[PDB]
UniProtKB/Swiss-Prot annotation, chain B:
Coiled coil (UniProt feature): none
Oligomeric and partner information: Homodimer.
Region span, Carboxyltransferase: 7-645
Binding site for CoA: 252, 555, 557
Protein name: Acetyl-CoA carboxylase
Subcellular location, record wording: Cytoplasm; Endoplasmic reticulum membrane
Function, as annotated: Carries out three functions: biotin carboxyl carrier protein, biotin carboxylase and carboxyltransferase. Involved in the synthesis of very-long-chain fatty acid synthesis which is required to maintain a functional nuclear envelope. Required for acylation and vacuolar membrane association of VAC8 which is necessary to maintain a normal morphology of the vacuole.
Domain CoA carboxyltransferase N-terminal: 7-343
Entry binding sites for acetyl-CoA: 148-150, 519
Length: 723, 733
């Protein structure tokens, strides 16, 4: 029954739509096996029910035989009991049916997709889209093809040309007969004693020919744009994804691309016709993984459909069950109560990931800041200068942004359409934001914020932005501002931590300071961190110049001081004066290097975490080895306090964030140190139910209008009040 | 005096700071309002040369913080600024606001500590920004700075000692820096104990106070300045959404200063004044070679104007001030006020003269503003001389600017049909790099033109609060390898996002010779923002999934073409050898027939029939049509906004249905002129009737609250001077 349609899809290198929930069931089971191999699953752990529009065109869960779809767009509401949600979590799966009219988007497919998107959106549940299509549906008025006539310039010579296309009374009568007179817009003329119905416009009786499909593209593009802000959106490019299909992948932002499946706008063949040469060899050349994964359009790659489904399910494990719910806490064997083992040094080169997830070493595993094996890196193929991913801190999921200290290189391919173009390698220095790494940073902030609704840790380590001509021309200023904007829009706790060996300077600090979003942001610097406007060399150039360098010499070098003192003798011969002056300038020459080194140390001494603390720009200075223990309780307390704020907001609401926490903090016992993270979180957790109870406890003219209608006895009272 | 014998006082001698500013190639802060007064007067002269102005037309009042740090107006001598950041609240009677309009001017003082940003400057800038934001008035920033303020603990400089490896040889090195008991006592004496963090050590029976951290007693040395940068960056980011923001790069703008230029989005750069993050000299020290020759090489107009970071260029400070004043003339006096209607000699009631042809090359601008021609001026869609193009140096494939349609200001996006070229400079740091010319075909969205489109939509929406017309004419996006690799997909999606966020009427008009296809229609369909968007297609426009040639390739292949030859050719039909020879003969003409057939589907009439466009239009009548449509839309929009005051929350489809019902029987809802006229003729009547309803419901509510819980409410009624006086009069009658 489904055997033919199944092969038809496999032939196209994709899974048949109705076979996808099975892959989700497999991925969900694997998820369990990796979490606790000793957990035995029942069929009630995973449930998939198709979504079909009812009598009133409203989407509803159903139990129906697969492949009975009257349209090329299908949907499922999945309910899974997962390690993070053992009682269950739900999401929606929208997918094109590649077997139904080549996976094209017609008005019906567009309306359904939109309805499904709104369904997920209304319920706050994630929307998963499986892209396997050929873009907007193309058509012509087939009923007109055997009917249309040609008004020849000379009927004896067709090469002399034609004036217009028309219908005869016969052709017009054939359309009337079949109830199709609205298929064309004609204009009656008489030529050679015959009614000629000049075709002014061809409309077609059949729907889904052109513009109507395009209106649908627009509708679904705007709907996706909207959904990205509202719920968790992800796309699996399971087969080719063309035109509107390509836009849907980017519009849902988060994308996993199956190796060998292209994300294209226009096919290689068409591009060759427009170019008038065989320029492009394939669609993969235009939109394969080597294009999209390198761009950052595709966040991850997959070997097959199951691999992709597994990566969706893994990504979702960091995402709340639905909008506004708390982030899914999933504690594992690597608990919070341990020091951080891997510590960077300025003398040995390191991979940030060792600091994040830890490092396998000959003498055993060196634990990092986050939970062993909790780091799920995304956008791994693009702007490799920044390291972005999801991690867990003692069970708490969060977004992580780290800085790649190593020089990063990337190949820009040769433009097939330009024979006077060659491939290009670009090298970018570590600890510097470039247009790409700045864009990725802003992108990461946004993706963690929207739908994922995650807290975030930026392990801040940037010298600044690349200020040179190339990068300035490639709009580094634009991409850096995105970071500020992304930070302003943030809605969950943010932690900015300058790690050991880390730094932040004038250009990099501007975009990460907590004052950007005081509601969510906090900054911390490691004891082995550095921050100042400029790097020591730059600061001495401005603030410890020659005059200062010569004063320090007079104070410190005996030889310099003595020679300067010899120049106080008002009895000197000019020649002798020139001699002492010469010896002094020769001592300055001799001392300039080391006194320059002294100045660098003096500048560096201002750039410390202790000055940052003293100046009130950071919350606390920290020791890397204790950062895990510290941050775990800080994040935990922040999330609890954030919950109570959200609760207080949904009752009163008419107060500032500052006013809302001050009230909440006033409910804590007097002996509770508000600066003690572990104590606060513990008290809150021990008292959620108790707190919930605590929580559960122009006009002057209208005022004149009613006051007048009141009784005499009442008016007498309010008269006394006015008096 | 320098010079002596001048007829009038030497302004540069009376205030030496003025000469310092000039010596840096910028205008003295305190002389900027004078330039605003000149620009405002020129504005009047160009509008109506026969208008006599009095000095009361322009007023500038310096804003300084009071005892409580609240911004207050002052009249004081220039150069009295105790901080390097100065502000003015300007009040001008302008052609668009003849009774007056107000804005705020924030500027760095380049003479005060080299225009650096210290915590005080940052706090003032933020306060000023909040001042403008609270009042809904525009915020103009004049950038002339050296970024964040750099400092060291000057009190430590004459005190610090060096622990030498060998005191006899300084080149052998040093261990650390320290203080003596004497230096420690010196700090205590001056109440500066907190300047350093020391650690007491005894080296050879001598007390050494090892310097562990230098803090400094003086504020504005490092990180505190950086916290200020962050605060002002976020404040600007916020203001861009709230009020009209613009920046004039009047002298160099460094670090945080460069970020402020971009963060306020709209920027005018004075030729020869750089927008830089790091100076060329420093970059040369970091690189270890003389790579860069100047700061202009990094952030001059040839970099920023070409980038789209700088929206416009200026020859001098006045030119820049003139361009600010011109740009503001399309912006409401303050947030949420109606767009400033400024009717000129070119009224709405006229046909459009310049019409493009399918066979001949044209500049979109001729369609927009009109064209000077040998036989006289050919009027365009908008008001003669009303087109103010911005971002003119970047992504020249799209034409963006402000215009007026019969006095109504709006944002305009047009498509450059000509091939556009741009020079990508050679990277000075890479000797294996050369300059590159890139050519981009007309009527196609590329990463740059897509970015500019989205940028334009955003800039018209935020602060400017303008309606917008997109003269939609795109084949699609460049889907080829280079552009796909250069993330065209990302930049195109920005357009969708930008459209979603739009808050004023949008008109999508496919003009004559215009087109929209599968790839380009996706990002401009009205369903993206049904609340604001409408689409129209000219009678000579085209729209379909693919271009005719693409559609025949899929839907009118050989078999169909030969069946067509069989029907429409006696010779071919009779033959059903010689048949293949007739196919050969007919192929070129039947290809034209198949293409015409295909094209016949791509018409405005099919768009109308399919319900994808509001109306199909004739270009020559588009001005007359759009004027009244926009006018009618703005009047309805205002009444929807006015209804967002009425007792109870309602959808916009509810609000429009309500407003529309009120229209008298004689008012044709399809007549844009009648509907706009009715709204305007009855605004006072509507406002009155509406007020009487917010009151009537308030009156009903209080009687409800009172006719149950009497005594308890009468006490609260009692609980709730000038107001008491009114209520007393009411009770007395
Ligand atoms: C070249 C590359 C490594 C990409 N890079 C590396 C950068 C940048 N570019 C930049 O465009 C920014 C930056 C920030 C940090 N820097 C300073 O603080 C600085 C200032 C003044 C100085 N004078 N002498 C030495 C100095 C150092 C150097 C420039 O780092
Ligand atoms: C000029 C250039 C930049 C190369 N360009 C010009 C473009 C693109 N690129 C594109 O990547 C997209 C596009 C869109 C409009 N097009 C069609 O609708 C179309 C489809 C199929 C076809 N088959 N034969 C001829 C055909 C035409 C052509 C390709 O325009």
């Amino acid at each position: 029954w489904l055997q033919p349609k199944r092969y038809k899809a496999h032939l196209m290198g994709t899974t048949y739509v109705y076979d996808f929930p099975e892959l989700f069931r497999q991925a969900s089971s694997s998820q369990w096996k990796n979490f606790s191999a000793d957990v035995k699953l029942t069929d009630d752990f995973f449930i998939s029910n198709e979504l079909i529009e009812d009598e009133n065109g409203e989407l509803t869960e159903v139990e129906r035989e697969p492949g009975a779809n009257a349209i090329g767009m299908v949907a499922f509401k999945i309910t899974v009991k997962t390690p993070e949600y053992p009682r269950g979590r739900q999401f929606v799966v929208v997918a094109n049916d590649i077997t139904f009219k080549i996976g094209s988007f017609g008005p019906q497919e567009d309306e359904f997709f939109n309805k499904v998107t709104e369904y997920a959106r209304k319920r706050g549940i994630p929307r998963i889209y499986l892209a396997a299509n050929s873009g907007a549906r193309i058509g012509m008025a087939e009923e007109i093809v055997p009917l249309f006539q040609v008004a020849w310039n000379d009927a004896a010579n067709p090469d002399k040309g034609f004036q217009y296309l028309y219908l005869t009374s016969e052709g017009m009568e054939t359309l009337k007969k079949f109830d199709k007179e609205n298929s064309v817009l004609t204009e009656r003329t008489v030529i050679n004693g015959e009614e000629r119905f000049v075709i002014k416009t061809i409309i077609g009786s059949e729907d889904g020919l052109g513009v109507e499909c395009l209106r649908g593209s627009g509708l679904i593009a705007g709907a996706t744009s909207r959904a990205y802000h509202d719920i968790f959106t992800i796309t699996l490019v399971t087969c080719r994804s063309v035109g509107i299909g390509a836009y849907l992948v980017r519009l849902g932002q988060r994308a996993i691309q199956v190796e060998g499946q292209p994300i294209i706008l226009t096919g290689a063949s068409a591009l060759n016709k427009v170019l008038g040469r065989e320029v492009y060899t394939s669609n993969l050349q235009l939109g394969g993984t080597q294009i999209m994964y390198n761009n950052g359009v595709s966040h991850l790659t997959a070997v097959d459909d199951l691999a992709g489904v597994e990566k969706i399910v893994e990504w979702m494990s960091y995402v709340p069950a639905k909008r506004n719910m708390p982030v899914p806490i999933l504690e594992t064997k690597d608990t919070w109560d341990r020091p951080v083992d891997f510590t960077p040094t300025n003398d040995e080169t390191y991979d940030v990931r060792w600091m994040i997830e830890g490092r396998e070493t000959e003498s055993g595993f060196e634990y990092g800041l986050f939970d062993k094996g909790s780091f799920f890196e995304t956008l791994s193929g693009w702007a490799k200068g920044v390291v972005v991913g999801r991690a867990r801190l003692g069970g708490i999921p969060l977004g992580v942004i780290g800085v790649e200290t190593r020089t990063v290189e990337n190949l820009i391919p040769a433009d097939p359409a330009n024979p006077n173009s060659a491939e290009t390698l670009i090298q970018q220095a570590g600890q510097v934001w470039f247009p790409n790494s700045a864009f990725k940073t802003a992108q990461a902030i946004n993706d963690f914020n929207n739908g994922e609704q995650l807290p975030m840790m930026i392990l801040a380590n940037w010298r600044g932005f690349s200020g040179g001509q190339r990068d300035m021309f490639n709009e580094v200023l634009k991409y850096g501002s995105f970071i500020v904007d992304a930070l302003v829009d943030y809605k969950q706790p943010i932690i900015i931590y300058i790690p050991p060996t880390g730094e932040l300077r004038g250009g990099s600090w501007v975009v990460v300071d907590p004052t950007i979003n005081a509601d969510q942001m906090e900054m911390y610097a490691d004891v082995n961190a550095r921050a100042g406007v400029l790097e020591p060399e730059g600061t001495v150039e401005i603030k410890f110049r020659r005059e200062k360098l010569l004063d320090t010499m007079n104070r410190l070098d005996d030889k310099y001081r003595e020679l300067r003192s010899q120049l106080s003798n008002k009895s000197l011969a000019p020649e002798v004066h020139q001699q002492i002056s010469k010896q002094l300038a020769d001592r300055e020459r001799e001392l300039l290097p080391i006194y320059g080194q002294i100045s660098l140390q003096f500048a560096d001494l201002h750039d410390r975490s202790s000055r940052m603390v003293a100046k009130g720009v950071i919350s606390k200075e920290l020791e890397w080895t204790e950062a895990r223990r510290f941050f775990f309780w800080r994040l935990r307390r922040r999330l609890n306090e954030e919950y109570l704020i959200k609760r207080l907001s949904h009752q009163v609401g008419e107060a500032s964030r500052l006013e809302k926490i001050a009230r909440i903090r006033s409910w804590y016992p007097a002996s509770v140190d508000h600066e003690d993270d572990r104590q606060v979180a513990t008290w809150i957790e021990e008292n959620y139910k108790t707190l919930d109870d605590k929580l559960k406890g122009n006009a002057i003219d209208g005022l004149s209008e009613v006051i007048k209608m009141l009784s005499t006895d009442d008016k007498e009272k309010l008269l006394k009040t006015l008096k």
